[model samples]
Target chain A: RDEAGITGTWYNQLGSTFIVTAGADGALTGTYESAVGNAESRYVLTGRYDSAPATDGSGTALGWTVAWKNNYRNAHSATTWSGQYVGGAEARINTQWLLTSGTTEANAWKSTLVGHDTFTKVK
Target chain B: RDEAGITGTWYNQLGSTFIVTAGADGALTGTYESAVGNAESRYVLTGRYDSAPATDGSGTALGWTVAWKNNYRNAHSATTWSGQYVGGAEARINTQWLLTSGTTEANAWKSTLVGHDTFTKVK
Candidate 1:
């Protein structure tokens, strides 16, 4: 039933929580509660899942976006990611992301930062 | 007044370009052309700004989401980020994002990933 796809409460390594509901079309609809700042604040998470991802053979591709919506959280920024959502006895979302922040002066260049995460169910 | 705010074509470290027009309300509206996969395909970029970010003691806070809209790209996923739009002699967009993908089994756990980028004008 629930194992059919992504429809449940999931947790990431940092303790952030996601309440998701996937459509039969594999469209992902959900809400995210961060483990970090504004831990109690819930954000809107919108994205798509490959009910037919070419990653894991059966289906594992997925991605989502979360707009921090904070007028000014110096340490917080809106987020998005791409990765595999592993399915089996347990569910998982593994992917990488880019934190987009301020603009520059000359449209020059600078260092690029990146991080990865593996998210599993709350059960 | 181009130096007044984020209203110009911006580029990231990877060559991704964002054509932006920041409203007086600080609403960011623009088009994003990735330097990577599907470099020819343009994506929608929407987010907000501080017009008064406390970062550099000015407007810097901002973030946005991009739906890869690609039911066609294994290495590609939707994108979004949050960062500062450092305005001055040049305009830029700096932020982070998460590309949401597939589903899981147990709603268990996994590792998390993150990255950062600096964007400047195309001129």
Candidate 2:
């Protein structure tokens, strides 16, 4: 059902979190964490969505084009996540992030942070 | 010759610029400009690289993973470019940019910037 409606756990707003795991072609692997103001910074994410079987006609499900990589303070660099994922009563998910190198800020090695964050669904 | 070694026009260092063009599979479309200081923002880029051959035999040729989107001030956000592209002579290229959203700069609609920039082949 659209990869079990996007696999599992999701939570957001500063104390970030994600544990997605939808694979069968539409990919989506995950493991995320954020909250830089008070430490907390984890990583590992991958993405894909748009698997077919939905020509719009209210067929439900469609949206996701993620990508990830930063590696904590070491800040390797990589982020390319987009949004959408809300169907039937709110499984909630609405993201936004895009930092491929290190958007100015005096360069701390790279990763200028960028996230409109939101991903509620831990049931 | 590896898509004519990546089409043409390229320059960098704050006064950024790029006009690539290489299709037929390896994609690589382009047109980018940067220099937010004196007001320069102009973009429209795409990406793709890694067209087989050379398997790292030092035969040089292979290195690129690009993505681009950020229509100037309107900042739509989207950039996923990784680099390398360095062969004989000096067709140099060495990118690095990743920002799928807006890393945080107090929200200006999003696009936190991220560019290590390096592309020199303007001949």
Candidate 3:
């Protein structure tokens, strides 16, 4: 079974699609088609998760990132997401996001935006 | 006058306010109060500009960054903005932003969101 519990395909409330492929361990990689911008273009996604997470209301802790490729709003821009893969009645991935416009320094923090999303597993 | 042509007070369409303090040169620093989430919080803003930009419809090319503090939703979250300061009938700054949640890797990109805003000078 998807050991990482994040491999299967998923679609977000915005209608964007995700196809996650899990590695032998906790490594998770995927491709995302955003509902915004060029929905026809595919973006690269990479992240990791706790193969084993503690039980509680705090489900499986996971993190992922996506860089805009064919996006007109400045291609090469990127975003980092922190989420919890909550397994329950609907089995949803709840996430909060942060995106950067371009090259940034270690101490650099600005010109960014914030938001959240909920995604559900498909097939 | 604003040497970098960007030292002044401004506010975005969202109602967030900016108090930009200019350096002797092209460096720009400021404080921003975002309209969303914690509207009372003062986020740090930093940017640079071309002291002598081409005189065209391009206006003045500028860029800035801001790091959200105190408001939660991953407090250290940040954003970068690229904009054009048009000095016409009404001075306005039109910008596009990208934000990231927290400590992110160089090659990492995902879970991020996208949006834009326009700021008008405050007198």
| B93: Cα error in model 3, Å | 0.6
Across residues A36-87, which tens digit of lDDT does each residue of candidate 3 receive?
6423567778998877677556788788998776444446567778988888
List where candidate 1 sits over 4 angstroms from the true fold.
Answer: A1-4, A21-29, A46-52, A55-59, A65-76, A96-116, B1-9, B12-15, B19-31, B44-52, B55-59, B64-82, B95-118
- Identify the superior model by lDDT, candidate 1 or candidate 2: 2
Clashes of 3: 25
- Give the number of the best model, judged by DockQ: 1
CAPRI-style docking class of model 2 based on DockQ? incorrect
lDDT of 2 by residue, A1-123 (tens): 467877887887555677778777777887776544322465767777654545464333334432344433544455566776765666676766655554465444244555566667753
Q: Chain B TM-score in candidate 1, rounded to 2 decimals?
A: 0.71
Q: What ranges in model 3 sit over 4 Å off? A: A1-123, B1-5, B70-74, B103-109
TM-score per candidate: 0.59, 0.30, 0.47
Best by lDDT: 3
Between candidates 1 and 2, the DockQ winner = 1
- Two-chain DockQ for each candidate model: 0.24, 0.16, 0.14
Looking at model 1 chain B, report the run of 10 residues with the lowest lDDT sum.
B103-112
